[PDB]
Design a protein that fits this description.
CATH architecture of chain C: 2-Layer Sandwich
Keywords (chain C): Acetylation, Cytoplasm, Disease variant, Exosome, Isopeptide bond, Neurodegeneration, Nucleus, Phosphoprotein, RNA-binding, rRNA processing, Ubl conjugation
Strand order of the largest sheet of chain B: 1-2-3-5-4
Shape of chain B: globular
GO biological process, one term (chain C): U5 snRNA 3'-end processing
Largest interface: B-D, 45 and 51 residues
Number of helices of chain C: 5
CATH class of chain C: Alpha Beta
Strand content of chain C: 25-35%
Helix content of chain C: 25-40%
Oligomer: part of a larger assembly
Chains: A mainly beta (183), B alpha+beta (252), C alpha+beta (287), D alpha+beta (265), E alpha+beta (286), F alpha+beta (237), G alpha+beta (289), H alpha+beta (241)
CATH architecture of chain B: 2-Layer Sandwich
Largest sheet of chain B: 5 strands, mixed
Structural class of chain C: alpha+beta
CATH superfamily of chain C: GHMP Kinase, N-terminal domain
Largest sheet of chain C: 7 strands, mixed
Protein name (chain C): Exosome complex component RRP45
Number of strands of chain C: 15
GO cellular component, one term (chain C): nucleolar exosome (RNase complex)
CATH topology of chain C: Ribosomal Protein S5, domain 2
Shape of chain C: elongated
Distance between the termini of chain B: 51 Å
Family (chain C): Belongs to the RNase PH family.
Order of helices and strands of chain C: HEEEEHEEHEEEEEEHEEHE
Distance between the termini of chain C: 35 Å
Strand content of chain B: 15-25%
């Protein structure tokens, strides 16, 4: 174990290659961060050196993921969300995703309707597909019956229970709201 | 009258100007000397990165509010706000300023843009915020070093660190270049200078100067002397960063 | 926020009703709306409301070191504020053009016309002089301001009274309104603006336009006048091409209009003084 | 799911940090850390931090009260405190806190303005007390007041004289004089959740997700200088007497601290 | 701005000692100097350096001296970076460059040996002269600082402060006595007023009068302030790039030589013009 | 907190809770009411009012006849609008609320890609909402669900559009109004009432239109004197 | 080295050195063109009270029945076949936004730019993302107009591979009313270089290659004997324009041939400028007639 | 000191009905799309017109019907003998901006350059009276040099009233005297006024006089300007070929 510094060299190119958090100058590699270095080794025997600030080391929500999020804004077209838990490990770097209109139910019917599936201020979980290019807009999908809304607060302040596929109700009083209930 | 601050008096002059005495002069010392330095990174909590540096009566903070959305056009930016606390210096100045704060801000930006690599931080602006709690000599150099520490702490990428150093000129008959001076050696001075470099690749990043006088050779000797001083200072900052990283490893 | 847009229907209807010489509420072109002048309890407050446009005016004094160029005469500080209650668009620091033009116009009109006596309000020539500021505030915005702002500033500056002062050499003694009776100001003549609005490049002209008429007008001619037929200011805005006879006629109109407004103002002040001389802290005049 | 996550601790009579709903965090000070200033005081409550520098200058008084030496506070919440602030002029919180500090200075009467007049009608001191936040983890008013008081005890001023021949005044920066302060106002904060749950010294999040806030300044001789109650879910005197008691306790504690410090110099 | 291949062209040109204007790396261009443009001022000047046109006014007013230095007066600088230069300046966008230039101009004159201010004092602590310099930008075609400096110096040389006797009297009554001899107005020396010199580094070679197209191609620029003797008052560095420690020395030597040449030429020119007289007709903006 | 039946014609003020009698019978909370548990919180000052369906099972309905000016996008309300702009397929129209509503180029009666409608910026419209909610921008339409514009679409031109209070409309559209009936005898006309306080009127000449608009914007509290006065004026036009 | 200062000399107006007494019809706003039965108006005029009133400063031109004006300084109005040189300013998701000396922001649709070689199938998202990595913001394109929209903008394209993106070269910005409307703006001169003369005021000057569409950057050096020529041409063009004369093959070639004695730098000093321009003008005039 | 000697002369040495020799030029700054310079006595205005170009930071203000005129004013510090600061941002320079804007939006004939900025800029180097009209005229010359269509020379000037007579093209002296000064700007061809500012007390029957006098002064200014412009156009065309 050794902590490095944004100026110190680490190794010749003949003794390693830059993986991340580094750069190269004439016949040498040079760190670029205050953190811990590590030289991994492939079966090829040529090491890959890298430097990491393990405070928030790295996370990556891949395609076949299951990520929770919070519904902030909505429209007849799409509903935007914020990423909180990628699996079960939270990430203070809250990424921002989107859910399309048709990409809401496995049946893919156009009859779907956002205001009857989602509402602003409720938590869902979905599957990412596209990372995005400019703003890294994750596009999430809920084309599955064990997906979508899990917790949802009532008209004003009550938490409801998922009775059926597109129904939810508050336990104190009685009122049938409409969502894309999960499971 | 400012309507965003408390109603004070129109004007207010200090008492010193009403004093009657010949203030004490420092005298003699080892020209190639450096003051004792206390540099620590990781002071502040609510900031992604922060650093604190004390050298004599000099006391400086710097914080780094990290990337905040706002090729050669999709290239990062860093905007720096230098700011001396109204309770530093013999005289008081309203918080705003508008004369030297901005000059020193330009200096910091011109000395940081090189070290920092902004290709890896596109479409983003790093808000660097320096604060001078007490002025006791070389200030802009302390600010460069503190901003460098804060950046390296927040984990922004770089090419090398930034080390500053301030010099002055003795107005004696045999004028010698005074290294890392005090506010007294600096107000009783003829010329002043400030170097800042990246010691690994040995490249200046931003310098500055001024003079009641001088000449080519003198300025050159000053430059090289400040370079040697910055070299002799680098290890302190190195150890500080290592220490902060160890404390982080300990916290988790 | 923003002002709701204007439909082409309303625009065309207005232009046609102008062609046919028909206003909306039911008045002619050479007529103002019922202007009311109401007073407050403190000498120097006046609420003047023409139709729906209400404007408030306060007048305050101070003693301060004068400016070297004029060590004999005092100072005067205008200011008009467009309160967000006047209309939505009047966010702070956004509608700056309107503020600038109104304030410059009012300053010009009152100050440079020498309406009050900046000399009478001297106390120590070189050290301490008075300082009269006047703050106008726009409460409801339905149409014509300049007229309202001016009537308010004038009713105030004619319904204001200073704390009396005694002097001997350099010894200056101020006193309170309860120890002596405050002294009024010194006016020479009361000017109040008059606003004409041009429609269809100059063909038609209206007086005291409402808000819609201001939205479908191309040009605005302000004319300041007195009861003695003395042009104090005139201004053309809106990027419009008028002529000579137009300004001549507009001036012959402003004459009568200002005469009448002045009669009213004087009646209002008379009634307020009468009331306070009988028990009562108000004063009211109606067009 | 922050609020829910927080009620869980609240109902266990605790907090997610280890505080028993009625106690504060590590309180510390540092006096005289700074030479360029007449008075200096650093305060920090765990992560929260504040620093006051008080400078002294001359100025001409008003005409309504010639024998009044001005005391001008100004609070600065620079962007390095928290990201909720941006480079530019002062926002709203800084200005409110400034007015709070000033209201305190004026009502507690810790200092007699008359004790700052040298030559009435001609000169009088002006104490520019500039406070600066450096970590806004929460409860910045308590820290500001406490640092102000600390530095305003540290401050020792010179002595001046008047010469009729020169018609001017001279200073003696060698001899000096401390500054007498009568009252020792301490501030105690509270955060009121939905109806009846009052937590003391609320940090950042606890203030973000709260229904109301409260602050109470409690002079030593069983009196109050300010009850800052900006909005909230409501309170009855029964949920207020308890806060006043706790404020008295905090007064005792911090006064002992400050005495120990000024005596350890 | 401009592309990358143009930058390649320009940098290889410099490395080859040629430039689009077919000039070397130590060659300014014809700078049209003029003086006594405006009349209401106590001094004035104008410069046209290639495609940068600067005007400079100088007003000698009477004001209170500075408490820390009552034995002499002071220079103040304002800089109107009129949007007429490039539309990207407005009531708020030019303050940045104006402030930068003004701070520089101050830093050039915290020297105590440039303008003998002691000669600008009438009655210590009571009255003094004050030189309000007002720079006014009208184009931006590069080498801006050098032209601004040349204008400051030409305006100073062309400055005519009147003689005034401020006589004290009892009971606080003050009187100023003029000299009705506009031909008998005093003149401040400029044998030390320095010229700025901007060495921009391109490739591995340094260049003077860095035209815009070449500024965009550069990474650093060392500003020097030289006097006709050879000393170096100020030494600033500007650029979003780095700079080696050795090249600094070459830059400084070149600045020294160029300053010598510049001051010689300016002195000769302005002596010539002062000789001619009103016969010159003062062709300006016509 | 008492006797919903005893204050069915009284002035209720916000904060007031009122409770209703009973196993029970379904009821409905009006616009100015709100539900707190099994009680009704009041949210707006108003002369409370009640109604029951002709049947006996429906229970009842409650509300407050609150007067005001600002409008809120509600569902199933006929509303005038002012096209503010067009973005590609959909053009945004103003209503007088928080934000501008949206139409679709193929919602008007009989329109497709090869047959677009004539809607120009500044044009005024008489539509109704199909999604009016606090969480989503409101979309409106100028066609009944069956597929025919039963009076919807662009208004037209050559009229006066003014604005009045909402309670004034809620009253005028009543089948037992006297003013709007008496006007059908003096001079003809044709007018659109929009539930957003916005009214459109047309007649043959213009004097008549103006007299009519003044009446309407004043008819909330007109005196018999002014009543017959303006009636005589219309008779003399 | 060499520095020189000099006072400003007063102009010599009226251009009497020529002595032409033109046979044109100059006008200025407010001037009344001939008012007759049904005369059509063109760019540079308007109508008022049955009276044809000028709108711009220049000479009037009466085509068979159409009355137009030909101002002396304008910004490039869009034609339909005119070539053009353009500096890019923005990269929108669909296209590129380019800067000509025009009253708006010219447009190059992603559909227009030719592809590497002739690999033409169709445009997909991969091309939409290469939309940047190939045509960087700030680069230069030598195109020809495709069409002009009703809003004033100009959509331009690239007919063949002779067009597209440009090498390193050098550039000048002049007024667009100083290039004769003619054919073959693309010249390759015997001097050792080549030149492109936009119907706008953007002239490009590049060394001529030996092989004979910008899809590769040949960022190689340039022989001194081919950079000195380019610099001389640049200064000669600036000279020509400073004296307000037209600009095309023969003009630049003859100013070149004139500026060989006078070295590569001393031919912007107004005296040398003027004498070179006079020589060129006189010899053109006398040889052509 | 005096304004109207009993003989009819002024201080400067000119009668009431005449004015001072304007000396102008067109083409000062080449890095722009239009420039001018004028000295209407001691005054020295300087105009610039960056042509109809693109809007950046669109900020939803690009009018789709017509063009967007943005005119900025500036009075240098050393203009007056009394040095001043904050030449921009003041409450007077902005009024001048408004005035110029509503003038040139009237004249500049924007219906042909929709969604485009016409950026006008004015700097006053020296002021000795008549500070608005000089700027109007310099900006006019600029517009013309930029080939921007415009209905007519928008010619401006000032008049005043002294000793029962009307003066034309006031200077600073009688401008400081406080007498009525009426500045205006009209289009000669049609006889229409584009702007009419005025500031001081005077009777009404004494209005037509100063009004027609200012108008006639503006006509003379028109003559001088148009002679300049015609010289310029002639020289340019001759140089072309």
């Amino acid at each position: 174990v050794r902590y490095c510094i944004p100026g110190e060299r680490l190794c010749n190119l003949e003794e390693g290659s830059p993986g991340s958090g580094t750069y190269t100058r004439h016949g040498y590699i040079f760190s670029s961060l205050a953190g811990c270095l590590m030289k991994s080794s492939e079966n090829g025997a040529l090491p890959v050196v890298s430097v990491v600030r393990e405070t928030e080391s790295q996370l990556l929500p891949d395609v076949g993921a299951i990520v929770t999020c919070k519904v902030s804004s909505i429209n007849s077209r799409f509903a935007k969300v914020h990423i909180l838990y990628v699996g079960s490990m939270p990430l203070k770097n809250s990424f921002r995703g989107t859910i399309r209109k048709e990409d809401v139910r496995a049946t893919e019917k156009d009859k779907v309707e956002i205001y009857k599936s989602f509402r602003p201020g409720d938590i869902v979980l979905a599957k990412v597909i596209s990372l995005g290019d400019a703003q890294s807009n994750y596009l999430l999908t809920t084309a599955e019956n064990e997906l979508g809304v899990v917790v949802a607060h009532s008209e004003s302040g009550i938490q409801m229970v998922p009775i059926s596929w597109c129904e939810m109700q508050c336990p104190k009083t009685h009122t049938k709201e409409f969502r894309k209930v999960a499971r | 009258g400012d309507h965003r601050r408390i109603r004070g008096p129109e004007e207010s002059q200090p008492p010193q100007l009403y004093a009657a005495d010949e203030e004490e002069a420092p005298g003699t010392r080892d020209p190639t000397r450096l003051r004792p330095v206390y540099a620590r990174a990781g002071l502040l909590s609510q900031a992604k990165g922060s650093a604190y540096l004390e050298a004599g009566g000099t006391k400086v903070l710097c914080a780094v509010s990290g990337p905040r959305q706002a090729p050669a056009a999709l290239r990062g930016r860093l905007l720096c706000d230098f700011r001396r606390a109204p309770f530093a210096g013999r005289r008081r100045r309203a918080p705003p300023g508008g004369c030297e704060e901005r000059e020193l801000a330009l200096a910091l930006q011109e000395a940081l843009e090189p070290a920092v690599r902004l290709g890896r931080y596109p479409r983003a602006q790093l808000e660097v915020s320096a604060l001078l709690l007490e002025d006791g000599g070389s200030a802009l150099a302390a600010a460069l070093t503190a901003a460098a520490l804060a950046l390296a702490d927040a984990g922004v990428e770089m090419y090398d660190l930034v080390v500053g150093c301030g010099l002055s000129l003795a107005p004696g008959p045999a004028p010698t270049w005074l290294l890392d001076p005090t506010r007294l050696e600096e107000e009783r001075a003829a010329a002043g200078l400030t170097v800042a470099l990246m010691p690994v690749l040995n490249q200046v990043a931003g310098l500055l100067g001024s003079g009641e006088g001088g000449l080519t050779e003198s300025w050159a000797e000053a430059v090289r002397l400040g370079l040697e001083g910055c070299q002799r200072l680098y290890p302190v900052l190195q150890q500080s960063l290592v220490r902060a990283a160890r404390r982080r490893g300990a916290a988790a | 926020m923003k002002e709701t847009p204007l439909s082409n229907c309303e625009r065309r209807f207005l232009l046609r009703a102008i062609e046919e010489k028909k206003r909306l509420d039911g008045r002619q072109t050479y007529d103002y709306r019922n202007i009311r002048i109401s007073f407050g309890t403190d000498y120097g407050c006046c609420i003047v409301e023409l139709g729906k446009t209400r404007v408030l005016g306060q007048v305050s004094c101070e003693l301060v070191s004068p400016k070297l160029n004029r060590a004999t005469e005092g100072i005067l500080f205008f200011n008009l504020e467009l309160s967000q209650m006047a209309a939505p668009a009047f966010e702070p620091g956004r509608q700056s053009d309107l503020l600038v033009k109104l304030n410059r116009l009012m300053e010009r009109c009152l100050r440079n016309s020498k309406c009050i006596d900046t000399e009478s309000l001297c106390v120590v020539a070189g050290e301490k002089v008075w300082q009269i500021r006047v703050d106008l505030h726009l409460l409801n915005h339905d149409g014509n301001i300049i007229d309202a702002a001016s009537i308010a500033a004038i009713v105030a500056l004619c319904h204001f009274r200073r704390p009396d002062v005694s002097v001997q050499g350099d010894e200056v003694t101020l006193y309170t309104p309860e120890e002596r009776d405050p002294v009024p100001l010194s006016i020479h003549h009361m000017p109040i603006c008059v606003s004409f609005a041009f429609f269809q490049q100059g063909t038609y002209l209206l007086v005291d336009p409402n808000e819609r008429e201001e939205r479908v007008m191309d040009g605005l001619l302000v004319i300041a006048m007195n009861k003695h037929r003395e042009i104090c200011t005139i201004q053309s805005s809106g990027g419009i091409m008028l002529l000579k006879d137009q300004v001549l006629r507009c001036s012959k109109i402003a004459g009568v209009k200002v005469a009448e407004i002045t009669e009213l103002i004087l009646k209002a002040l008379e009634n307020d003084q009468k009331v306070r001389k009988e028990g009562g802290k108000f004063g009211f005049a109606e067009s | 799911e922050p609020l829910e996550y927080y009620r869980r601790f609240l109902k266990e009579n605790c907090r997610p940090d280890g505080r028993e709903l009625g106690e504060f965090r590590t309180t510390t000070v540092n006096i005289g850390s700074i030479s360029t200033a007449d008075g200096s005081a650093l305060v920090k409550l765990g992560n929260t931090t504040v620093i006051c520098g008080v400078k002294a200058e001359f100025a001409a008084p008003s005409t309504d009260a010639p024998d009044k030496g001005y005391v001008v506070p100004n609070v600065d919440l620079p962007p390095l405190c928290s990201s909720r602030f941006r480079s530019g002029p002062p926002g709203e919180e800084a200005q409110v806190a400034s007015q709070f500090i000033a209201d305190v200075i004026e009502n507690s009467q810790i200092i007699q303005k008359e004790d700052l007049c040298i030559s009435p009608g001609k000169l009088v001191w002006v104490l520019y007390c500039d406070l600066i936040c450096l970590d806004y983890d929460g409860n910045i008013l308590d820290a500001c007041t406490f640092a102000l008081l600390a530095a305003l005890k540290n401050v020792q001023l010179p002595e001046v004289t008047i010469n009729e021949e020169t018609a001017l005044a001279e200073v003696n920066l060698k001899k000096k004089s401390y500054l007498n302060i009568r009252t020792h106002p301490v501030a105690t904060s509270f955060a009121v959740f939905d109806d009846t749950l009052l937590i003391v010294d609320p940090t950042g999040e606890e203030e973000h997700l709260a229904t109301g806030t409260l602050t109470i300044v409690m002079d030593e001789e069983g009196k109050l200088c300010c009850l800052h109650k900006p909005g909230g879910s409501g309170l009855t005197g029964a949920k207020l007497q308890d806060c006043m008691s706790r404020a008295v306790t905090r007064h005792k504690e911090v006064k002992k601290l400050m005495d120990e410090v000024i005596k350890s110099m | 701005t401009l592309s990358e291949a143009e930058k390649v062209y320009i940098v290889h040109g410099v490395q080859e000692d040629l430039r689009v204007d077919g000039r070397g790396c130590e060659d300014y261009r014809c700078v049209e100097v003029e003086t006594d443009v405006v009349s209401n001022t106590s001094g004035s000047a104008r410069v046209k350096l290639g495609h940068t046109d600067i005007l400079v006014g100088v007003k000698a007013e009477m004001g209170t001296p500075k408490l820390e230095k009552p034995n002499e007066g002071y220079l103040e600088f304002f800089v109107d970076c009129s949007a007429s230069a490039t539309p990207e300046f407005e009531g708020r966008g030019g303050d940045d460059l104006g402030t930068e230039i003004a701070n520089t101009l101050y830093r050039i004159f915290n020297n105590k040996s440039s303008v003998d201010l002691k000669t600008l004092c009438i009655s210590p602590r009571e009255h003094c002269w004050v030189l309000y310099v007002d720079v006014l930008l009208l184009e931006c075609g590069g080498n801006l600082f050098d032209a601004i400096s040349i204008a400051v110096k030409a305006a100073l040389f062309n400055t005519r402060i009147p003689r005034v006797r401020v006589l004290e009297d009892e009971e606080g009554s003050k009187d100023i006595e003029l000299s009705d001899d506009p031909y008998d107005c005093i003149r401040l020396s400029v044998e030390n007023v320095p010229c700025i010199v901007t060495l921009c580094k391109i490739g591995y070679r340094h260049v003077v009068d860095a035209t815009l197209q070449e500024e965009a191609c550069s990474l650093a620029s060392l500003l020097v302030s030289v006097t006709s003797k050879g000393v170096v008052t100020c030494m600033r560095k500007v650029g979003k790039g780095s700079l080696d420690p050795e090249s600094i020395f070459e830059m400084m030597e070149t600045g020294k030589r160029v300053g010598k040449v510049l001051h010689a030429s300016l002195q000769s020119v302005v002596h010539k013009e002062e000789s001619l007289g009103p016969k010159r007709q003062k062709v300006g903006f016509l | 907190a008492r006797a919903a039946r005893t204050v069915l014609g009284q002035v209720v003020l916000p904060g007031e809770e009122l409770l209703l009698p009973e196993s029970r019978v379904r009821v409905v909370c009006g616009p100015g009411l709100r539900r707190c548990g099994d009680r009704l919180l009041v949210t707006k000052c108003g002369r409370l009012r009640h109604k029951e369906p002709g049947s006996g099972s429906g229970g009842g309905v409650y509300w407050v006849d609150s007067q005001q000016k600002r409008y809120v996008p509600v569902k199933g309300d006929h509303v005038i609008g002012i096209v503010t702009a067009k973005s590609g397929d959909i053009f945004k129209v103003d209503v007088g609320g928080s934000e501008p509503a949206s139409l679709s180029y193929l919602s008007f009666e009989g329109a497709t890609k090869r047959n677009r409608p004539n809607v120009q910026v500044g044009d005024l419209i008489y539509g109704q909402f199909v999604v009016a909610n606090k969480d989503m921008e409101p979309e409106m339409v100028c066609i009944d669900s069956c597929g025919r514009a039963n009076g919807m679409g662009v208004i037209g031109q050559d009229g006066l559009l003014f604005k009045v209070t909402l309670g004034l409309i809620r009253k005028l559209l009543a089948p037992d109004c006297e003013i709007i009936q008496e006007v059908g005898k003096l001079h003809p006309l044709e007018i659109v009432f929009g539930m957003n306080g916005r009214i459109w009127v047309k007649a043959k000449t213009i004097q008549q239109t103006l007299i009519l608009a003044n009446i309407l914007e004043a008819c909330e509290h007109m005196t018999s004197d002014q009543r017959k006065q303006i009636f005589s004026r219309l008779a003399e036009s | 080295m060499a520095m020189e200062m000099r006072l400003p000399v007063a102009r010599k107006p009226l251009s009497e050195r020529l002595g032409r007494d033109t046979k044109k019809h100059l006008v200025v706003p407010g001037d009344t063109i001939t008012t007759d039965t049904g005369f059509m108006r063109g760019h540079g005029t308007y109508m008022g009270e049955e009276k044809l009133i000028a709108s711009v400063a220049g000479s009037v031109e009466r085509v068979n029945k159409l009355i137009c004006v030909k101002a002396l300084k304008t910004r490039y109005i869009g034609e339909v076949g005119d070539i053009v040189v353009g500096r890019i300013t923005e990269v929108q998701q669909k296209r590129w936004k380019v800067e000509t000396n025009s009253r708006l922001d010219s447009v190059l649709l992603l559909s227009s730019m030719n592809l590497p070689g002739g690999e033409l199938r169709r445009r997909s998202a991969e091309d939409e993302l290469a939309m940047r990595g190939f045509l960087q913001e700030g680069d230069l394109i030598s195109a020809e107009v495709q069409a002009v929209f009703s809003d004033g903008a100009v959509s331009l394209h690239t007919r063949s591979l002779k067009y597209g993106k440009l090498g390193q070269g050098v550039l000048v910005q002049v007024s667009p009313s100083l290039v004769k409307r003619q054919k073959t703006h693309f010249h390759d001169l015997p001097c050792g270089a080549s030149v492109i003369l936009g119907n706008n005021g953007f002239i490009w000057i590049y060394p001529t290659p030996e092989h004979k569409g910008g899809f590769i950057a040949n960022l190689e050096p340039v022989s001194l004997a081919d950079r000195e020529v380019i610099s001389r041409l640049r200064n000669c063009i600036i000279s020509l324009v400073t004296q307000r004369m037209m600009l095309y093959d023969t003009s630049i070639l003859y100013c070149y041939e004139a500026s060989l004695p006078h070295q590569i730098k001393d031919i912007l000093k107004p005296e040398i400028m003027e004498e070179i321009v006079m020589e060129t003008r006189q010899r053109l005039l006398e040889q052509e007639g | 000191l005096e304004l109207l000697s009993d003989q009819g002369y002024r201080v400067d040495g000119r009668r009431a009905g005449e004015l001072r020799k304007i000396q102008a030029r067109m083409g000062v700054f080449a890095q722009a799309d239009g420039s001018a310079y004028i000295e209407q006595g001691n005054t020295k205005a300087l105009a610039v017109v960056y042509g109809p170009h693109e809007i950046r930071g669109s900020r939803a203000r690009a009018l789709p019907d017509r063009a967007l005129v943005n005119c900025q004013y500036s009075s240098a510090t050393f203009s007056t003998g009394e040095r001043k600061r904050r030449p921009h941002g003041d409450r007077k320079s902005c009024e001048m901006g408004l005035q110029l804007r509503q003038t040139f939006e009237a004249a500049i004939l924007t219906q042909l350059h929709p969604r485009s900025q016409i950026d006008i800029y004015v700097q006053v180097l020296q002021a000795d009276g008549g500070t608005y009209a000089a700027c109007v005229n310099a900006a006019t010359l600029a517009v013309l040099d930029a080939g921007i269509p415009m209905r007519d020379f928008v010619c401006a000037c000032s008049a005043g009233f002294v000793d029962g007579t009307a003066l034309a093209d006031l200077s600073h002296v009688e401008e400081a005297a406080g007498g009525p000064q009426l500045a205006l700007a009209l289009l000669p061809a049609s006889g229409q006024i584009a702007l009419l500012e005025m500031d001081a007390r005077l009777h009404e029957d004494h209005l037509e006089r100063v009004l027609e006098a200012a108008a006639q002064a503006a006509r003379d200014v028109h003559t001088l300007l148009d002679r300049v412009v015609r010289q310029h156009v002639r020289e340019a065309s001759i140089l072309l070929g």
